């Protein structure tokens, strides 16, 4: 969902 990286 969230851009972790």
């Known amino acids: 969902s969230y ?3």
């Open 3 to 5: 851009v972790k990286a």
